[PDB]
Design an enzyme around this catalytic site. Structure first.
Site, PDB file in Angstrom:
ATOM      1  N   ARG A  86      -4.573  -6.418  -8.042  1.00  0.00           N
ATOM      2  CA  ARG A  86      -4.165  -5.317  -8.462  1.00  0.00           C
ATOM      3  C   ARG A  86      -3.987  -5.600 -10.131  1.00  0.00           C
ATOM      4  O   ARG A  86      -3.903  -4.540 -11.194  1.00  0.00           O
ATOM      5  CB  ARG A  86      -2.846  -4.637  -7.774  1.00  0.00           C
ATOM      6  CG  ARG A  86      -2.474  -3.267  -8.703  1.00  0.00           C
ATOM      7  CD  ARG A  86      -1.184  -2.900  -7.798  1.00  0.00           C
ATOM      8  NE  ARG A  86       0.099  -3.622  -8.284  1.00  0.00           N
ATOM      9  CZ  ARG A  86       1.124  -3.532  -7.458  1.00  0.00           C
ATOM     10  NH1 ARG A  86       1.135  -2.881  -6.147  1.00  0.00           N
ATOM     11  NH2 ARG A  86       2.279  -4.239  -7.871  1.00  0.00           N
ATOM     12  N   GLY A  93       0.803  -1.148  -0.155  1.00  0.00           N
ATOM     13  CA  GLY A  93      -0.023  -0.028   0.022  1.00  0.00           C
ATOM     14  C   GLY A  93       0.796   1.289  -0.024  1.00  0.00           C
ATOM     15  O   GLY A  93       0.227   2.322   0.305  1.00  0.00           O
ATOM     16  N   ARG A 134       3.348   0.152 -15.958  1.00  0.00           N
ATOM     17  CA  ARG A 134       2.331  -0.417 -15.763  1.00  0.00           C
ATOM     18  C   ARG A 134       1.017   0.493 -16.310  1.00  0.00           C
ATOM     19  O   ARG A 134       1.567   1.785 -16.202  1.00  0.00           O
ATOM     20  CB  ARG A 134       1.941  -0.730 -14.290  1.00  0.00           C
ATOM     21  CG  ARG A 134       2.665  -1.616 -13.491  1.00  0.00           C
ATOM     22  CD  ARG A 134       2.439  -1.524 -12.109  1.00  0.00           C
ATOM     23  NE  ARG A 134       3.467  -2.575 -11.206  1.00  0.00           N
ATOM     24  CZ  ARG A 134       3.792  -2.424 -10.165  1.00  0.00           C
ATOM     25  NH1 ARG A 134       3.430  -1.433  -9.257  1.00  0.00           N
ATOM     26  NH2 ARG A 134       4.760  -3.191  -9.597  1.00  0.00           N
ATOM     27  N   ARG A 137       7.932 -11.700  -5.732  1.00  0.00           N
ATOM     28  CA  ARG A 137       7.291 -10.748  -4.960  1.00  0.00           C
ATOM     29  C   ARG A 137       6.984 -11.411  -3.777  1.00  0.00           C
ATOM     30  O   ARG A 137       7.311 -10.710  -2.622  1.00  0.00           O
ATOM     31  CB  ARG A 137       6.139  -9.776  -5.408  1.00  0.00           C
ATOM     32  CG  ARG A 137       7.094  -8.785  -6.468  1.00  0.00           C
ATOM     33  CD  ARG A 137       5.871  -8.412  -7.619  1.00  0.00           C
ATOM     34  NE  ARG A 137       6.517  -7.712  -8.433  1.00  0.00           N
ATOM     35  CZ  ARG A 137       6.717  -6.237  -8.571  1.00  0.00           C
ATOM     36  NH1 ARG A 137       6.346  -5.465  -7.454  1.00  0.00           N
ATOM     37  NH2 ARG A 137       7.341  -5.602  -9.551  1.00  0.00           N
ATOM     38  N   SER A 156       2.561   2.933  -2.581  1.00  0.00           N
ATOM     39  CA  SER A 156       2.091   3.982  -3.620  1.00  0.00           C
ATOM     40  C   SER A 156       0.604   4.488  -3.266  1.00  0.00           C
ATOM     41  O   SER A 156       0.468   5.829  -3.377  1.00  0.00           O
ATOM     42  CB  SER A 156       1.682   3.484  -4.872  1.00  0.00           C
ATOM     43  OG  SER A 156       3.007   2.600  -5.430  1.00  0.00           O
TER      44      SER A 156
END
Ligand SMILES: Nc1ncnc2c1ncn2[C@@H]1O[C@H](COP(=O)(O)OP(=O)(O)O)[C@@H](O)[C@H]1O
Ligand SMILES: Nc1nc2c(ncn2[C@@H]2O[C@H](COP(=O)(O)O)[C@@H](O)[C@H]2O)c(=O)[nH]1
Ligand SMILES: [K+]
Length: 190
Positions: free
Chosen positions: A133, A12, A40, A144, A14
């Site tokens: 997302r 969270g 992106r 990740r 960004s």
């Protein structure tokens, strides 16, 4: 005093930072890192990152243009000296978004920031939001999530982070972030 936000991919950061800058663009300036990964949708060159090739980055890194750099989930990232100098030159509080390697490297520089770790409610929730997302490939997601498990260690390494914020309820996390920065905010007269 600059601000370094760290935490796993999908935590969270960004999102919290977008809220911080829309409310306090007069006080804060974002450090625009360089990265080799692809943009992106919605990301903007010179805004979210300077999207460059691994080759140029390695060249600039060797030339000594970077404060720190790190390989993360298949890509190269780094905070150039200029991205930070630009913010400080405009008399703004510099805010950085970097991984744990970035945090460890910055600890050895004269940036001297406050370090904040943004933690998801749990790995399951982290995975669910990251998948939702829907911006990473399955291979990227695996890397990740692996990094997240591994790095979540750090939120606890004694003395590493000045504060840990759990991004469970977003409004609550954002209020926590602003309180942590209330001084800088008040001083800057914001
Ligand atoms: N408190 C929250 N609850 C639910 N979803 C959230 C919350 N905060 C952020 N998100 C969503 O989770 C995803 C990951 O957040 P993002 O800020 O992009 O993470 P980071 O920049 O740390 O990788 C995004 O789709 C974002 O909109
Ligand atoms: N060390 C370091 N990590 C960075 C930098 N820019 C972004 N990152 C980090 O690399 C990870 C991936 O970011 P993303 O690809 O999701 O934008 C995140 O943990 C993020 O904080 C940078 O300049 N240095
Ligand atoms: K960054």
């Amino acid at each position: 005093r600059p601000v370094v936000l760290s935490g796993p991919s999908g935590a969270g950061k960004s999102t919290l930072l977008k809220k911080l800058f829309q409310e306090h663009s007069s006080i804060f300036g974002f450090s625009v890192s360089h990265t080799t990964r692809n943009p992106r949708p919605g990301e903007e060159d010179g805004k979210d990152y300077y999207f460059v090739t691994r080759e140029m980055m390695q060249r600039d890194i060797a030339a000594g243009d970077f404060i720190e750099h790190a390989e993360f989930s298949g890509n190269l990232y780094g905070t150039s000296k200029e991205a930070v100098r630009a913010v400080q030159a405009m008399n703004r509080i510099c805010v950085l978004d970097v991984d744990l390697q970035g945090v460890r490297s910055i600890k050895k520089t004269d940036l001297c920031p406050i370090y904040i770790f943004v933690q998801p409610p749990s790995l399951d929730v982290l995975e669910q939001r990251l998948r939702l997302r829907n911006t990473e490939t399955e291979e990227s997601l695996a890397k990740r999530l692996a990094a997240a498990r591994t790095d979540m260690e750090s939120s606890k390494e004694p003395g590493l982070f000045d504060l840990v914020i759990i991004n469970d309820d977003l409004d609550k996390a954002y209020a926590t972030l602003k309180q942590a920065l209330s001084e800088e905010i008040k001083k800057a007269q914001g």
